[PDB]
Design a protein around this ligand. Structure first.
Ligand code: CLA
Ligand code: CLA
Ligand code: CLA
Ligand code: CLA
Ligand code: CLA
Ligand code: CLA
Ligand code: CLA
Ligand SMILES: CC1=C(/C=C/C(C)=C/C=C/C(C)=C/C=C/C=C(C)/C=C/C=C(C)/C=C/C2=C(C)CCCC2(C)C)C(C)(C)CCC1
Ligand SMILES: CC1=C(/C=C/C(C)=C/C=C\C(C)=C\C=C\C=C(C)/C=C/C=C(C)/C=C/C2=C(C)CCCC2(C)C)C(C)(C)CCC1
Ligand SMILES: CCCCCCCCCCCCO[C@H]1O[C@H](CO)[C@@H](O[C@H]2O[C@H](CO)[C@@H](O)[C@H](O)[C@H]2O)[C@H](O)[C@H]1O
Ligand SMILES: CCCCCCCCCCCCO[C@H]1O[C@H](CO)[C@@H](O[C@H]2O[C@H](CO)[C@@H](O)[C@H](O)[C@H]2O)[C@H](O)[C@H]1O
Ligand SMILES: CC1=C(C/C=C(\C)CCC[C@H](C)CCC[C@@H](C)CCCC(C)C)C(=O)c2ccccc2C1=O
Lengths: 85, 176, 42, 156, 730
């Protein structure tokens, strides 16, 4: 090579940039950075609204946790009275 | 039950190893002191100012002359006197063998006690780093491949490919 | 480690690291000059 | 000396009952988390439906293995080192009082077992402390694939 | 010996001059010994009197080979992946003309490498992976590059089990010389648990991934790579999740099904392999047997039992030995292994087992002649090693008085017959042809032997072939056509460029080749049979077993006293077999192309590579160079400047190497001595020779350098002659 000014006039820069909000990754899962979601206190289908659904419910999913095992239900086969249909 | 190496050029193999590793010494400190670039910054012009370049290869011949003489003359005498013919001491020639190389010629000889020695006192300094340097260099030279390969850009060549996620370098650090 | 008046041995066919190779470096002169049939000189 | 691994008729299972303790507390995390699992993109996809309601939020980084090799070192060191005869713990390069051992070469609750005096209470052979934890090991083994799926518990 | 015995040198011996038979290599110098020792590197007279190890060595040598195949064929499977041809061909098969292999361009090289392909320059291949291969469904080049390293895994390990024997301190007698299980295991669960295991990865995965390939796609438009478990929706097509059966059995109902299977008979149209679906069932129905079968048993028991009046007492304790001969339990094997390879060579060409073969002509006849020379190169062997038994292996006599001791009892007898057998043949088995010449060159066809002239009249048709397809009168159920398509009854219809497979009806001019085979198979065997039988003592020599199965020849007396021995019966027996196989090959392709290999054309008018020239014209044994050698071979001597060219360019060498053999075969021995000195003289004048006494070839070495060359000469000649008349038209 040969050199004219100054290796750089202004050095090295954006090649890793990230700095403030050096984000991507943490965040993204910005929905995640926080998880804050639903309710506080309870009844029922958080699951929003966004996010969505109640789908199967109390134990299911949620799982997730749901939470707290109720006096249920009690998943086990048997009930669900298997509602198809 | 195990190979027998012991191999016998050998003791030579270890002194070959010093050459490689002490030489390996020049690299690390200087490049890395590196100017901790650098305060800033580095320009060559100066000789090579515009003389149609300086070295290219011609630089390599001078490098070698200066050396040839040295690497050459050399082992030629690390040692070795007696220097002929028929039957074995084994070093492998062994000629120096009994005669040191000289009875009565000169002071070939260095120092007290019909001997070569600087003498007893020191392994000390230089068996542990200089050989520890046998080690050092190898990992740090093993470090050099690590430091360039992957060529960020310029050249994939022949791809079955299948990188990127991201580039490779040295500045230092590591990410992660 | 080898000085003056013959040295150490070698196996049955190190000729197979002498046919292969040395000789091998010669294709290496038969593509540098990919051709012959007379030859310029130096 | 070019290398030694003495084996007599049962070398194996001296380990084995050994591969078994380790293996066994790895039935373990089964005993007491449980899925890498696989080939890691999810990024979209579980076996074949896995999941649903990809694994996990999943931190983990394979750096292990870089870990498996690295701790490997400890394993094979404890074993040579005690070949032994011991300098080993240097203590304080100078001077004077070094009461402290902490006790033992360990095995068990007092480096020397210790606090000898005890219970009024709680009041009312050591391959068995092995045997039953394969009977905890090979158990999740089939419980990975523990399904009949198309049908389910015939029993029931 | 003593560099230094026992207890106290680890230190290896390299050096001080080294070893064999006790006036061991002299000290003082010679050449022959450098030829000794590659030869008869193992014989096992020497190393130890006592079998001791050797069985402890032959397990290790075996390991080496298994690795090696593995080193091989990783190589092959490589090559096959990353010089692909294959991805390209498979969308594309029946267009493609396939290579694994490419040169680099240095000097001439590269005439060789001529467009094969899905658009690349190649050397065209005739062993088919690409057909073993069709089976993998999943596809893509980098895997085969896993199957490849999976190969190099098995190797290093299935090659450190050979460290993990002999060299490692290692095993003792009982372990082989108590047999009692060994086939128990082998046939049960590998013979079984492979074919079994092969079933499981032969409908799981392969069947489906060519069930909907036999249409097209660009693969993976079809197949995900793992895709194939708990899952399966896909089995649903190709059939049910058994829906409600239980573990087979019956209280099962089909109103419409029966599990995958459903037997095929005949060939696929648009992939005429034969159904990819009898392929599971058949392997499944194998293994079971083996699965049940390898469950005998522990021995003399069965062998010691039945005796007869002719029949043999010997039959009993028909060999305490057998457990420890070895050389015998290899000789038996080779006859079978060997004779059980060239039974491949038929069931292959008259019942392809891989997708795209037949249409692929050249990539399954190469086969049928490679597999063909092993079911022969391994049989003459299967005699040699019996001769090696018959002379030596047991210390002492105690085999005694049996079945063998019986067979020998007659011996100028079993071989007394067999002889006339051959001259009856030969006269009815070759001069038969010579009639034709002498009388068609005299020229009066009225009286030849032509399929038309001497009367059978125009049917071949009924023997077996016609009962064989026609098959379901039967307790037979099954499958629209044949076991083999070729058999007489049935079908026009097989394949898409081209003909693959059709009746082949023979007549005469299949009649008499079929008979030259007899006479060729028979006089081969005469020489080996009489060779291995008269192994140890003969009416010409009694003192006959005394060094050797090898010795050159006993000595100028008794008249001749030369050939004798049985290295040499296994020297003149190769000499024949080279024909045995060399003319069976000559048979198949002249048929398979004169009839069968084909083309289809509108309205299916078949166009055989040669409109059946065979007809009236193989019967003449000149027609065999009019119609063969001078007809085809015109492609060998035209082949210059091309791509294959390496064949035409071999076909001169090796058609040279052969015509170098005779020099080694036809010559004296103290001759090249008498010469080797004139040489040795000129040598000494300049001071340039004596050390390592240069010596001529070891009577029988000279024969070793006959034969071996006569074969790798006379053989690759056709390996060239062939690949040069199926590549390019045909
Ligand atoms: C990414 C991965 C994750 C996964 C899957 C693993 C997996 C593994 N790690 Mg590990 N590890 C991780 C993250 C992970 N690690 C992290 C983030 C660290 C840093 C702290 C470690 C540090 C670590 C060490 C030091 C070791 C392992 C070891 C292991 C292996 C031990 C097997 C076992 O069951 O031991 C545990 C099961 C037992 C039955 C042993 C019981 C002993 C217990 C009672 C001691 C620890 C519990 C203790 C009372 C808790 C007090 C708190 C204390 C941690 C401060 C296993 C394969 C070990 C190994 O395999 O070395 C060869 C050991 O080396 N890991
Ligand atoms: C499963 C069996 C197999 C096994 C394990 C053996 C094992 C043995 N055989 Mg044997 N043999 C076999 C099959 C087998 N044979 C077959 C099929 C035949 C029929 C051809 C023979 C015919 C035979 C004879 C005649 C003899 C043996 C002998 C032996 C013993 C000597 C081995 C030796 O020194 O290597 C010998 C190998 C060499 C010296 C290597 C030279 C190979 C040359 C000819 C090259 C072949 C051509 C090829 C194209 C060249 C490579 C390409 C090149 C152009 C680049 C040994 C116990 C010998 C004995 O004395 O018994 C104790 C006796 O010589 N065998
Ligand atoms: C050498 C390579 C080839 C390649 C590239 C792969 C790649 C893979 N295999 Mg795999 N596999 C192979 C040969 C290969 N296999 C062979 C030959 C076998 C048997 C011989 C298997 C048996 C196998 C199993 C049983 C599994 C995989 C799984 C996987 C996947 C984990 C990937 C992941 O998502 O992590 C990020 C990965 C795609 C795992 C999988 O597919 O489920 C997630 C599964 O556990 N493979
Ligand atoms: C040929 C080799 C084999 C043998 C015979 C030895 C022998 C020795 N090593 Mg060593 N070593 C080996 C392989 C071997 N090593 C390998 C593969 C490594 C990995 C690179 C090391 C890394 C290593 C280190 C870091 C040290 C040694 C040290 C030593 C010496 C005493 C250990 C010590 O001071 O620490 C125990 C620490 C103490 C404070 C002990 C004090 C006095 C008592 C406790 C000694 C017992 C001893 C001569 C030590 C030494 O002084 O070498 C320069 C040093 O600790 N070795
Ligand atoms: C079955 C046999 C065996 C044979 C006869 C060959 C033959 C060949 N290989 Mg090969 N190979 C093998 C096993 C084999 N390989 C195995 C097991 C591997 C895996 C390590 C390879 C990996 C390999 C590579 C990467 C290459 C070859 C190439 C070649 C060709 C170059 C010639 C050469 O090696 O020297 C000179 C030649 C046709 C070269 C090629 O294909 O380019 C023309 C290429 O260099 N081979
Ligand atoms: C020895 C053979 C080979 C192997 C290793 C497997 C292995 C497997 N098969 Mg399988 N299979 C095979 C031959 C094989 N098969 C053959 C020849 C057929 C047809 C004749 C089948 C028809 C078949 C069906 C219909 C299914 C399997 C399933 C399975 C999986 C779990 C159930 C099981 O079979 O064993 C483990 C035993 C129990 C779980 C009990 C497992 C991966 C099932 C699956 O997808 O996963 C559950 C199920 O779909 N197979
Ligand atoms: C040398 C011995 C002794 C004798 C004298 C015979 C004699 C005979 N055996 Mg025989 N056999 C023997 C030992 C003997 N066997 C032993 C030890 C075995 C077991 C290895 C057998 C297994 C055996 C079988 C399977 C058969 C014979 C048959 C025969 C008969 C041939 C048919 C015939 O001529 O009528 C035909 C005349 C017509 C006019 C029609 C003949 C009577 C055959 C038979 O049963 O008769 C046909 C049958 O093939 N044998
Ligand atoms: C214990 C156990 C087990 C076992 C497993 C295993 C280990 C198996 C296997 C499997 C197997 C074990 C298989 C095998 C197979 C085999 C085969 C399949 C064979 C083959 C071969 C080949 C392919 C060859 C060929 C050829 C010929 C023809 C001759 C010569 C030439 C060649 C080589 C080409 C089980 C599962 C129960 C599970 C549980 C546990
Ligand atoms: C001058 C000179 C020379 C000469 C050369 C020449 C002249 C040659 C030749 C040659 C010829 C003239 C011939 C040869 C041939 C060879 C061969 C031929 C080899 C081999 C082989 C192979 C590899 C085979 C294989 C196979 C198989 C697999 C089996 C059977 C079939 C076949 C055969 C195919 C040289 C350079 C050398 C040296 C120097 C001097
Ligand atoms: C322990 C301290 C390290 C040693 C260095 C301190 C100085 C002590 C002398 C050793 C110095 C080496 O150099 C010196 O060694 C000898 C000590 O025997 C000196 O003195 C001696 O030399 C001969 C042995 O070599 C003797 O026979 C002589 O009577 C005496 O002159 C030498 O003139 C000098 O070559
Ligand atoms: C080579 C010497 C001939 C001696 C054997 C002749 C006896 C049998 C007759 C011809 C044998 C060839 O069999 C062939 O018949 C027909 C040619 O006319 C072709 O007939 C085919 O083509 C047409 C397309 O729909 C239809 O007429 C048929 O349904 C179909 O089978 C077929 O491709 C093949 O089945
Ligand atoms: C021609 C012929 C010879 C003469 C053949 C000889 C002498 C061949 C041996 C020649 C060797 C192979 C030459 C070896 C020399 C080179 C290997 C040494 C230099 C090494 C290189 C690098 C070239 C016999 O000895 C013979 C014996 C019995 C029956 C028939 C015949 C027979 O027909």
């Amino acid at each position: 090579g040969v050199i004219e000014e100054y290796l750089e006039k202004s050095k090295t820069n954006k090649e890793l940039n990230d700095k403030k909000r050096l984000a991507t990754t943490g965040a993204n899962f910005a929905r995640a950075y926080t998880v804050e979601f639903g309710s506080c206190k309870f009844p029922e289908n958080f699951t929003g609204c966004q996010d969505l659904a109640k789908q199967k419910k109390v134990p299911f999913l949620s799982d997730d946790l749901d939470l707290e095992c109720e006096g249920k239900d009690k998943y086990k086969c048997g009930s669900n009275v298997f509602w198809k249909w | 039950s195990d190979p027998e190496s012991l191999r016998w050029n050998v003791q030579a193999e270890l002194v070959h190893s010093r050459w490689a590793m002490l030489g390996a010494a020049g690299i690390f400190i200087p490049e890395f002191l590196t100017k901790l670039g650098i305060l800033n910054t580095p320009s060559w012009y100066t000789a090579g100012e515009q003389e149609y370049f300086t070295d290219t290869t011609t630089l390599f011949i001078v490098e070698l002359v200066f050396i040839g003489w040295a690497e050459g003359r050399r082992w030629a005498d690390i040692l070795n006197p007696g220097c002929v013919n028929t039957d074995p001491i084994f070093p492998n020639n062994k000629l120096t063998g009994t005669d040191v190389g000289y009875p009565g010629g000169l002071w070939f000889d260095p120092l007290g006690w019909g001997s070569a020695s600087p003498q007893k006192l020191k392994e000390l300094r230089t068996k542990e780093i200089k050989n520890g340097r046998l080690a050092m260099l190898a990992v740090m030279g093993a470090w050099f491949q690590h430091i360039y390969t992957g060529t960020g850009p310029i050249d994939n060549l022949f791809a079955h490919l299948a990188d990127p996620g991201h580039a490779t370098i040295f500045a230092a650090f590591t990410p992660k | 480690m080898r000085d003056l008046k013959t040295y150490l041995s070698v196996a049955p066919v190190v000729s197979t690291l002498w046919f292969g190779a040395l000789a091998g470096l010669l294709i290496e002169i038969n593509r540098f000059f990919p051709d012959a049939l007379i030859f310029p000189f130096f | 000396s070019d290398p030694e691994g003495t084996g007599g008729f049962i070398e194996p299972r001296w380990l084995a009952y050994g591969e078994v303790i380790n293996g066994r507390f790895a039935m373990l995390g089964a005993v007491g988390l449980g899925k890498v699992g696989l080939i890691p993109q999810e990024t979209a996809l579980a076996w074949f439906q896995t999941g649903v309601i990809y694994n996990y939020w999943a931190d983990n980084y394979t750096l292990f293995v870089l870990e498996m090799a690295l701790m490997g070192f400890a394993e094979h060191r404890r074993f040579q080192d005690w070949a032994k005869p011991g300098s080993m713990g240097k203590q304080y390069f100078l001077g004077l009082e070094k009461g402290f051992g902490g006790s033992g070469n360990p095995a068990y609750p007092g480096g020397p077992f210790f606090n000898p005096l005890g219970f009024g209470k709680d009041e009312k052979k050591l391959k068995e402390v092995k045997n039953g934890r394969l009977a905890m090991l090979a158990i999740l083994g089939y419980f990975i694939q523990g399904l009949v799926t198309g049908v389910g518990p015939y029993q029931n | 010996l003593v560099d230094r015995d026992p207890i106290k040198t680890s230190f290896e011996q390299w050096a001080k001059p080294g070893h064999f038979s006790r006036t061991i290599a002299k000290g003082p110098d010679t050449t022959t010994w450098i030829w000794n020792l590659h030869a008869d590197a193992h014989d096992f007279d020497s190393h130890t009197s006592d079998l001791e190890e050797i069985s402890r060595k032959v397990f290790s040598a075996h390991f080496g080979q298994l690795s090696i195949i593995f080193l091989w064929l990783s190589g092959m499977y490589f090559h096959g992946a990353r010089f692909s041809n294959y991805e390209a061909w498979l969308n594309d098969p029946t267009h493609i003309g396939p290579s694994a292999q490419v040169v680099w361009p240095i000097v001439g090289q590269e005439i060789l490498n001529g467009d094969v392909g899905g658009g690349f320059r190649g050397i065209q291949i005739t062993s088919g992976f690409f057909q073993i291969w069709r089976a993998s469904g999943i596809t893509s080049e980098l895997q085969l590059y896993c199957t490849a390293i999976g190969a190099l895994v098995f190797a290093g390990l299935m090659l450190f089990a050979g460290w993990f024997h002999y060299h490692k301190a290692a095993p003792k007698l009982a372990w082989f010389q108590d047999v009692e299980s060994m086939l128990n295991h082998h046939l049960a669960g590998l013979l079984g648990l492979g074919s079994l295991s092969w079933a499981r990865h032969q409908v799981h995965v392969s069947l489906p991934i060519n069930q909907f390939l036999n249409a097209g796609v660009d693969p993976k438009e079809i197949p995900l790579p793992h895709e194939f478990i708990l899952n399966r929706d896909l089995l649903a097509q190709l059939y049910p999740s058994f829906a409600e059966g239980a573990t087979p059995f019956f209280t099962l109902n089909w109103s419409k099904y029966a599990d995958f299977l459903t037997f095929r008979g005949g060939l696929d149209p648009l992939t005429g392999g034969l159904w990819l679906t009898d392929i599971a069932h058949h392997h499944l129905a194998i293994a079971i047997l083996f699965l049940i079968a390898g469950h005998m048993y522990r021995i003399k028991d069965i062998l010691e039992a039945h005796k007869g009046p002719f029949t043999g007492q010997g039959h009993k304790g028909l060999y305490e030995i057998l457990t420890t001969s070895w050389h015998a339990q290899l000789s038996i094997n080779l006859a079978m292994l060997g004779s059980l390879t060239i039974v491949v060579a038929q069931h292959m060409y008259s019942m392809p087992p891989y997708p795209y073969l037949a249409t692929d002509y050249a990539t399954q006849l190469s086969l049928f002649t490679h597999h063909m020379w092993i079911g022969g190169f391994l049989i003459v062997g299967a005699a040699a090693h019996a001769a090696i038994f018959m002379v030596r292996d047991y210390d002492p006599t105690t085999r005694y008085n049996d079945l063998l001791d019986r067979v020998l009892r007659h011996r100028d007898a079993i071989i007394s017959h067999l002889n006339w057998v051959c001259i009856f043949l030969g006269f009815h088995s070759f001069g038969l042809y010579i009639h034709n010449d002498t009388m068609s060159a005299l020229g009066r066809p009225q009286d030849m032997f032509s399929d038309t002239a001497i009367q059978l009249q125009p049917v071949f048709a009924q023997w077996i072939q016609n009962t064989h397809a026609l098959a379901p009168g039967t307790t037979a159920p099954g499958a629209t056509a044949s076991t083999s398509l070729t058999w007489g009854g049935g079908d026009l219809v097989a394949v898409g460029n081209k003909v693959a497979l059709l009746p082949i009806p023979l007549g005469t001019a299949d009649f008499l080749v079929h008979h030259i085979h007899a006479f060729t198979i028979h006089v081969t065997v005469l020489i080996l049979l009489k060779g291995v039988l008269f192994a140890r003592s003969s009416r010409l020599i009694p003192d006959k077993a005394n060094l050797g199965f090898r010795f050159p020849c006993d000595g100028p007396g008794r008249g001749g006293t030369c050939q004798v021995s049985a290295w040499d019966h296994v020297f003149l027996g190769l000499f024949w077999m080279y024909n045995s196989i060399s003319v069976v090959i000559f048979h198949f392709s002249w048929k398979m192309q004169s009839d069968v290999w084909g083309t289809i054309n509108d309205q299916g008018v078949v166009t055989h590579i040669t409109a059946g020239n065979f007809a009236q014209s193989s019967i003449t044994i000149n027609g065999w160079l009019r119609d063969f050698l001078w007809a085809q071979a015109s492609q060998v001597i035209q082949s210059y400047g091309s791509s294959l060219s390496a064949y035409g360019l071999f076909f001169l060498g090796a058609h040279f190497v052969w015509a170098f053999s005779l020099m080694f075969l036809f010559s004296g021995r103290g001759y090249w001595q008498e010469l080797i000195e004139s040489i040795v003289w000129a040598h000494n004048k300049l001071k340039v020779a004596p050390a390592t006494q240069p010596r001529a070839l070891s009577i029988v070495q000279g024969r070793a350098v006959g034969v071996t060359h006569y074969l790798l000469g006379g053989i690759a000649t056709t390996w060239a002659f062939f690949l040069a008349r199926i590549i390019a038209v045909g």
